[PDB]
Design a protein around this nucleic acid. Structure first.
Ligand SMILES: [Mn+2]
Ligand SMILES: [Mn+2]
Lengths: 929, 295, 165, 302, 51
DNA sequence: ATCTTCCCTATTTAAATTGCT
DNA sequence: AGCAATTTAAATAGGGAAGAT
């Protein structure tokens, strides 16, 4: 590897980086180094070139592509290294940036006018309840609305009038309404409980007129008259001139505001709100010290009076203005040019040369990567990102362990921690034992990286470790919940960090089908927000349903419409890149996405069907599923075994179902040597982690290394009874599976856990589908709702899987890829597709995906909750002693193959099952006994 | 303190001539006798060498050794036929991996095991020829080179004494050196005290292969003071076996090509860097001693 | 003032403080603290500590006190005599509980028992939480707990190593 | 392989000492043994409990025991018989799929050293915890198979070489390695002084109850048999960071220090016996520790 | 099993029986009564029992 | 508008000296 | 002997103004 590093730094920092860059490369003179170094040499050079201080101006070239660029060095757009750099380059009709500046400046000088009431003064001094009857943002909104109703609010002297209690402060003037919504929602968004309003309201002001004081601001309301008697000590020199210059700025630019569309207004006001909380939290974090008394805004850690309200408003204004400037004029730090990506894929990765069919100069890209598992999907996503140049992306993945797997792939192929940042925000205690030096695994949290210039506008220089890893990451391999808060939050400033993260970075969401329906709705909201700033969305899901692919394209198309009309460019359409392991297709799609997507789906189906059938599923006829499991285990051991040893996966639905199947199979008298494992999610930290590592090392069938992790000498049935934790994110390879039916994507995923690593075709049948789910004996009205898309609004007419599924069927992604809306009441696949198009629709609703008008409100974050689960309290095992109503029990010790013990950790119990003892056990975790 | 760069992937490579080697402002550099200060990339240097009129200091040697750069001094040869004595500072403050030295000792003390290792290392130069084929000079797979390496392999297979190995060593060196001489149409005699460019390019490559061999041996902690091939003529240490594994494959055709094209010594330095870097000859030698040690 | 160290070692089978108290008792019974040798403890946080430190002005040698503590030699350690310009001197504080002062009211004021209960019924009952030792008293035949706390340095000491007045 | 330990696996106690009865003698009048009586003095004081604030007004007439030497005898005499029994490898509740493998894995145990340290803890005065403290003269007489042994100056912390302990250790190791039993009548005479207060073992009282119960057989002060059994097996100097001999426990755990020395660092007895029945090479010290546990006994099942 | 509760006391009461320290011999008294009619079944049948 | 020349303008590099280890 | 702090100063870059085509 031959690199060349050029440096244009000033001051003695130029000399301090010369020591390190002259420790690793030869000096060619004139502050230019050039030579041969290794991969990790480049890394050590990155780590000790960035850590040496601020102001490092380093460009590295590997062959002729830029390896890395330290700082905001413009470096290369076409040629490299400029000369007479200077200012005043373009100076356009910027319009919408002047609009955002005027809105943020006018609102930020009015965002805390409502702290001047006597209640907030005695709240800061501390002789009343610290919770206000009406929040000060609403009081400042009442001030601004009363001033606007009285005088002309855009060109007049200010003077705060006598204000009363107003239920609504939103009128008709679109720009005033924007300023009012920025003022009122600078801490939290208003929440609308009204069902008719949630049913009908769509527009900007027409929804904003329904935002009343009862949506969170009106806490208790007994001291309203003191909350609206206000002093007017803000009339000073610099506050009045700042208010005048920003109001006239808005006055001069609001003529382009009425030429915007609804989508524009929503996205622009979201940006304005994010910059306003950025400036407000930035000025509230630091201590300024000086004060002019008689009025105060915030309190220090000692509770003393600080940050008087005139200079507080001025500081929040300038900090929000500077926030806006750096978030709207940033050339963000991108990743290194990974040299182990750009070469050609060989063999089964040979489809990854589809990036040589995509244009490298497209400003936008919507990848739908429909490639099957085991083909290197995430490596292909990184290849697609690097085809357009240097990489800046957020790999948002479900589960901690899948982020760990993608991080380990990124580490061992070409990516160091100067470009990658693995973020899992829980600090799990799963450590690697055996040998610390001989590990060559366990990707960790260090991020030598490079701190971006956006950290100076965040509160108190961003944060410590976690938010520095969030914001400053070129490549952010993260759990997805660090990105879905970009679309907005209920309370606080947790929106700004993923918002500013997704503003300048691409978004790569892998296996989006494993998320929930509301989770997929907020993920497509994130896709729309990412496309709002021209970034590229890579979706990587093999079993995509047309509905999902369509609504994600429509979210990207609305976002790219926002980005196109935001830079005053005519919208040519979205560069959609359909991708699988058999080919690629790049089309400029502005309309008719459905026929092209279904034609690519049909081409992928015909490229999947002439291949040999790997998963032949038979739906059993035996009604009782207990003895159906027994007979199917006996049949698939007598048919599918490797010299007497067979691996079976009993995929069931819920935990007590799993322990019921386990306790039946343990007490089942047979000549077969059944060896039973329980693989559900309710387990203690230690025990769970141990199951994972063992299962990953015994079900690895790409080699014969497993022969030494199990007793393959004696003919044995190694059976793993598992819940849907096996069908998501597990690289497992079973000889056969017996599936309790809950949804068709569960069938396809548990087909993907059988012969995942081998290529031998089954002869007779490798999957035995149960006749009924076990909830049929508990609830015959609805049985597929647990881990399925059946529900109270979408009920199957019959629950028989002979009626709702094929008796003999080759299970692949084809049934999920096709998409059928008719006959959803008597087939599982059409039931699935129905729900997917009836929840992820092209409407705005309130919990929908095109959400417009409601982004202003708190409604999409309350009624569409990301990871909406049950109450979930956590019973914690502390050194062998349980906390709550747990009561350790003893398992049946009949056929347990492996049982790992646990002493620490915690189990997640729903509040429903907290009533009784969860009865934790070493073999199977939680049950009802 | 990080992984400190592994030795087999270290890339830079110098022999410094007529310059006092010092440290300015953090980095190791060398200052010639005209005021020119050229920096040494000590974190990626494999070895440095010191010719006549050179002088290194203490903290420069420390920054080379603690980073792990083996340093030798080129002069010291005073006999008529032999490269006599090269003085070589080992970085022993870095505590080395141990069991590779134990394996080398368990093969060194057993006489039949040393002979067995002597056998495989004599055909290691034969496979070096086969793997590292240059674009210029001779072709390795011609009838003459294959006939002589076949006679060499047949003779070293039936060998039973180290003096027979020394004799067959002499016929091998005479055979290759003279065949290269024939190809480049010159008369060649290997004298280290000769003004002919085919000779002092060969001594420069002797110093280069010496530095490569001590970096390969020090990367596995192997001392020069365990020569598995020994004799009256062959008394230099283990460096005169792991250095001349790669004469007739790497250095000697490169030395003959450099003495045929006939620019200065610096193109030969840079060509040695280029071929030791492109084919990873250092990592190749380390991996070969790796498959030697555990067998 | 020069000083010497007596550190209790290997006293796990028996508490460390029992060995400390027996060191105090054996230093009392075989002289040592005539009027001028005093004790201090470097580690009173909540325990009395495991180091006895003797800061006699005239000078304590190793031989006399190692002959004195011949009985504790299995689990004792004596350091060489070092010097210290300031030692942190402790004194004796004692507790009274009901009947103690009642008998005082018998023998000083000459009042009867019931009125002595009457003047002291709602009073007394202090509780010392200071670090302490447990001392065999030989002249008065009962074993008790003696409490030590920090006070200003006094020229004269008792027979136990604590300050006077 | 993978010889999994039985859940019922237990071993009997092989060092059985009697209760250490305590008498008052003189140093030169060793035959006149008068039994040390536990006196008991009453103490008047109100009750102070966390659960009953209403009962603190009146009650709790407590009467705390004590035990001193009489004011005419200056020597405390402690008599107990330590019974070492053989076949320490026989499990009483275990069986012989695991215990027989233990027999054939701990046959190379040097019982000589094990027994030495047992008889040295017998003789040096490890069985005399708080009443060897402050004694100007320590003496131990061991009577074994009509043989009398005299010990005067043995430092208890290190196991130094004396041919007297060694002599008994021979027959003790011959018992412990083979089949049978041996009985050591141990009488300790410690000259504490005239009327010095002695230390019997303590019965467990409740958080309330009385202050302290001293151990009584038929009115006379004594010390617990298991407490002496703690003394005899206090031979463990082979754990990592071994400073003082601790009692040989299956986890190397001392309660009074609040730490366990062999727990959680792969040197606990259970991992070593599973290593023995799976046949990895043990050193001499941990195998001696395992044999000392099997001599101590206890149920090892899970 | 778990080694992290090797700390703190086990502290419980058991029953014990020792000889008093004035007598050194344990006597065990019992009466063993062997009884005849061993082949008759007390409550079983009369064919299988006599065979 | 474009481009050049020149004057601020101070920001930015290189040398120089010298205790300190 | 290397370096560090710290001064000192020479030079590099840029912006504004004015004069040419
Ligand atoms: Mn506020
Ligand atoms: Mn504020």
């Amino acid at each position: 590897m031959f690199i060349r590093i050029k440096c244009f730094s000033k001051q003695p920092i130029a000399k301090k980086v010369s020591r390190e860059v002259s420790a690793y490369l030869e000096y060619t003179g004139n502050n230019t180094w050039e030579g041969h170094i290794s991969g990790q040499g480049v890394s050590n050079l990155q780590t000790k070139l960035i850590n040496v201080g601020k102001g490092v101006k380093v460009v590295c070239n590997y062959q002729d592509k830029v390896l890395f660029a330290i700082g905001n060095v413009a470096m290369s757009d076409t040629g490299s290294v400029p000369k007479y750099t200077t200012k005043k380059v373009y100076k356009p009709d910027d319009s919408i940036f002047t609009l955002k500046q005027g809105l943020v400046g006018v609102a930020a000088l009015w965002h805390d006018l409502g702290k001047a009431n006597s209640y907030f003064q005695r709240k800061l001094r501390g002789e009343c309840n610290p919770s206000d009857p009406v929040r000060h943002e609403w009081v400042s909104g009442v001030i601004v609305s009363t001033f606007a109703k009285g005088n002309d609010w855009l060109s007049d002297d200010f003077i705060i009038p006598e204000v009363k209690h107003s239920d609504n402060v939103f009128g008709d003037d679109q720009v005033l309404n924007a300023v009012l919504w920025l003022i009122n929602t600078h801490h939290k968004k208003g929440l609308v409980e009204d069902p008719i309003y949630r049913a009908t309201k769509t527009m900007f002001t027409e929804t904003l007129q329904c935002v009343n004081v009862n949506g969170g601001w009106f806490n208790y309301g007994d001291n309203i008259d003191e909350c609206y008697k206000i002093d007017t000590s803000f009339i000073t020199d610099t506050y009045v001139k700042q208010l005048n210059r920003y109001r006239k700025k808005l006055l001069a630019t609001k003529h382009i505001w009425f030429t915007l569309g609804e989508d524009q207004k929503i996205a622009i006001l979201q940006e304005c709100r994010v910059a306003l909380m950025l400036g407000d939290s930035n000025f509230s974090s630091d201590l300024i010290g000086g004060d002019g008394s008689h009025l105060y805004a915030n309190l220090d850690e000692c509770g003393n009076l600080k940050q008087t309200l005139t200079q507080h408003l001025l500081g929040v204004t300038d900090c929000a203005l500077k926030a806006l400037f750096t978030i709207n004029h940033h050339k963000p730090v991108k990743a290194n040019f990974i040299p182990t990506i750009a070469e050609k894929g060989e063999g089964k990765f040979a489809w990854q040369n589809g990036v040589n069919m995509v244009d490298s100069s497209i400003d936008n890209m919507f990848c739908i990567n429909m490639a099957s598992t085991g083909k290197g999907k995430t490596l292909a996503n990184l290849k697609l990102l690097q085809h357009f140049g240097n990489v800046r992306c957020s790999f948002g993945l479900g589960m901690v362990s899948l982020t760990k797997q993608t991080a380990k792939q990124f580490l061992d192929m070409g990516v160091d921690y100067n470009s990658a940042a693995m973020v899992t925000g829980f600090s799990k205690s799963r450590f690697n034992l055996g040998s610390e030096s001989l590990d060559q695994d366990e990707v960790s949290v260090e991020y030598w990286g490079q701190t971006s210039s956006l950290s100076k506008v965040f509160p108190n220089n961003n944060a410590g470790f976690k938010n520095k890893k969030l914001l400053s990451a070129p490549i952010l391999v993260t759990t997805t919940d660090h990105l879905v808060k970009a679309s907005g939050v209920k309370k606080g400033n947790k929106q700004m960090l993923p918002y500013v993260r997704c503003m300048h970075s691409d978004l790569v969401l892998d296996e989006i089908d494993d998320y929930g329906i509301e989770d997929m709705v907020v993920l497509a909201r994130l896709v729309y927000l990412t496309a709002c700033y021209g970034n590229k969305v890579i979706i990587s899901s093999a079993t995509i349903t047309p509905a999902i692919s369509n609504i994600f394209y429509e979210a990207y198309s609305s976002g790219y419409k926002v980005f196109c009309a935001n830079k005053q460019t005519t919208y040519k359409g979205v560069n959609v890149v359909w991708w699988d392991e058999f080919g690629i297709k790049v089309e400029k799609v502005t309309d008719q996405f459905s026929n092209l997507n279904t034609r690519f789906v049909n081409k992928r189906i015909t490229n999947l069907l002439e291949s040999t059938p790997k998963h032949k599923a038979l739906v059993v006829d035996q009604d009782d599923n207990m003895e159906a499991v027994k007979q199917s285990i006996t049949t698939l051991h007598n048919a599918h075994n490797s010299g007497g040893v067979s691996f079976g996966l009993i995929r069931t639905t819920t935990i007590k179902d799993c322990v019921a199947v386990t306790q039946e199979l343990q007490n089942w008298e047979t000549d077969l040597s059944i060896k039973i494992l329980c693989y559900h999610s309710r387990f203690v930290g230690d025990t769970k982690a141990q199951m994972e590592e063992y299962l990953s090392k015994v079900l690895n069938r790409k080699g014969d290394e497993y022969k030494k992790f199990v007793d393959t000498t004696t003919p044995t049935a190694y059976i793993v009874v598992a819940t849907p934790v096996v069908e998501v994110g597990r690289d497992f390879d079973f000889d056969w599976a017996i599936i309790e039916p809950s949804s068709e994507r569960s069938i396809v995923q548990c087909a993907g856990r059988v012969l995942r690593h081998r290529s031998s075709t089954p002869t007779t049948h490798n999957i035995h589908i149960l006749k009924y789910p076990f909830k049929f004996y508990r609830n015959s009205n609805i049985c597929y709702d647990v881990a399925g898309y059946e529900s109270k609004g979408y009920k199957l007419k019959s629950k028989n899987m002979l009626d709702i599924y094929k008796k003999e069927s080759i299970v692949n992604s084809v049934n999920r890829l096709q998409g059928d809306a008719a006959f959803y009441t008597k087939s599982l696949t059409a039931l699935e597709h129905k729900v997917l198009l009836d929840k992820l629709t092209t409407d705005i609703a309130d919990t929908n995906v095109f959400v417009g008008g409601w982004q202003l409100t708190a409604n999409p974050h309350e009624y569409c909750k990301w990871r909406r689960g049950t109450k979930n309290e956590d019973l914690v095992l502390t050194d062998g002693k349980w906390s709550g109503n747990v009561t350790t029990t003893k398992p049946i010790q009949s056929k347990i193959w492996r049982k790992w013990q646990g002493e620490n950790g915690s189990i997640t119990v729903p509040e429903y099952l907290l009533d009784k003892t969860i009865c934790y056990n070493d073999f199977y975790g939680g049950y009802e006994n | 303190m990080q992984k400190q760069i592994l030795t087999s992937q270290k890339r830079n490579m110098y022999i410094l001539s007529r310059c006092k080697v010092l440290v300015k402002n953090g980095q190791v550099c060398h200052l010639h006798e005209d005021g020119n200060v050229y920096t040494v990339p000590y974190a990626n240097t494999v070895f440095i060498g010191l010719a006549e009129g050179t002088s290194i200091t203490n903290e420069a040697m420390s920054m080379l050794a603690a980073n792990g750069v083996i340093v030798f001094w080129t002069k010291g040869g005073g006999y008529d036929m032999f490269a006599a004595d090269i003085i070589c500072h080992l970085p022993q403050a870095d505590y080395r991996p141990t069991k590779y030295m134990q394996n080398w000792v368990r093969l060194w003390l057993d006489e039949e095991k040393k002979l067995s290792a002597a056998k495989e290392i004599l055909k290691m130069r034969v496979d070096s020829l086969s793997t590292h084929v240059h674009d210029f000079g001779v072709d390795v797979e011609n009838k003459r080179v294959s006939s002589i390496v076949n006679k060499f392999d047949k003779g070293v297979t039936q060998a039973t004494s180290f003096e027979s190995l020394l004799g067959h060593e002499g016929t091998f060196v005479k055979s290759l050196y003279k065949e290269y001489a024939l190809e480049y149409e010159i008369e060649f005699k290997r004298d280290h005290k000769s003004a002919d460019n085919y000779n002092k390019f060969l001594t420069l490559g002797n110093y280069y292969a010496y530095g490569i061999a001590r970096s390969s041996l020090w990367a596995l902690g192997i001392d020069n003071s365990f020569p598995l091939l020994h004799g009256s003529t062959r008394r230099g240490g283990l460096v005169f076996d792991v250095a001349d594994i790669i004469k007739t494959s790497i250095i000697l055709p490169l030395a003959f090509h450099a003495a045929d094209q006939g620019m200065s010594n610096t193109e030969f330095k840079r060509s040695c860097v280029a071929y030791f870097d492109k084919n990873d000859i250092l990592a190749y030698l380390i991996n070969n001693i790796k498959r030697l040690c555990m067998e | 003032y020069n000083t010497i160290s007596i550190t209790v070692v290997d006293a796990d089978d028996v508490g460390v403080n029992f060995v400390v108290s027996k060191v105090l008792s054996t230093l009392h019974n075989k002289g040592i603290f005539n009027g001028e040798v005093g004790v201090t403890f470097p580690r009173m946080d909540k325990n009395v500590g495991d180091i006895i430190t003797l800061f006699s002005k005239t000078g304590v040698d190793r031989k006399v006190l190692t002959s004195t503590l011949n009985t504790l030699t299995d689990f004792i350690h004596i350091g060489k005599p070092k010097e210290a310009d300031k030692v942190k001197t402790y004194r004796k504080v004692d507790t009274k509980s009901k009947g103690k002062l009642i008998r005082r009211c018998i023998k000083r004021k000459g009042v009867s028992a019931e009125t002595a209960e009457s003047l002291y019924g709602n009073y007394k009952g202090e509780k010392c939480k200071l670090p302490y030792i447990v001392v065999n008293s030989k002249s008065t035949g009962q074993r008790f707990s003696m409490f030590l706390e920090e006070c200003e340095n006094s020229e004269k000491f008792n027979s136990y190593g604590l300050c006077i007045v | 392989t993978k010889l999994k330990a039985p859940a019922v696996l237990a071993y009997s106690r092989k060092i059985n000492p009697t209760n250490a009865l305590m008498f008052a003698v003189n140093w030169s009048d060793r035959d006149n043994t008068t039994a040390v009586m536990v006196g008991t003095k009453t103490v008047a004081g109100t009750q102070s409990v966390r659960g009953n604030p209403n009962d603190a007004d009146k009650g709790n007439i407590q009467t705390v025991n004590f035990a001193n030497l009489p004011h005419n005898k200056n020597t405390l005499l402690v008599k107990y018989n330590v019974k070492f029994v053989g076949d320490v490898f026989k499990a009483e509740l275990g069986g012989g799929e695991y215990s027989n493998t233990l027999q054939t894995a701990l046959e190379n145990t040097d019982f000589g050293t094990l027994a030495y340290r047992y008889v040295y803890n017998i003789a040096a005065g490890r069985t005399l915890w708080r009443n060897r403290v402050g004694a100007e003269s320590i003496e131990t007489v061991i009577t074994v198979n009509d043989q009398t042994f005299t010990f005067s100056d043995l430092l208890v912390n290190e196991f130094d070489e004396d041919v007297d302990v060694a002599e008994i250790a021979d027959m003790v190791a011959g018992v412990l390695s083979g089949e049978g039993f041996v009985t050591l009548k141990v009488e300790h005479y410690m000259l504490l002084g005239e009327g010095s207060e002695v230390f019997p073992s303590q019965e467990f009282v409740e958080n309330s109850k009385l202050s302290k119960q001293l151990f009584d057989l038929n009115g006379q002060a004594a010390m617990h048999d298991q407490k002496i059994g703690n003394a005899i097996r206090t031979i463990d100097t082979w754990y990592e960071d071994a400073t003082t001999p601790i009692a040989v426990e299956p986890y190397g755990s001392v309660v009074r220090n609040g730490v366990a020395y062999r727990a959680g660092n792969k040197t606990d007895l259970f991992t070593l016996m599973d290593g023995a029945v799976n046949g990895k090479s043990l050193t001499e010290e941990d195998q001696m520790f395992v044999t000392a546990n099997l001599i101590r006994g206890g149920v090892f099942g899970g």
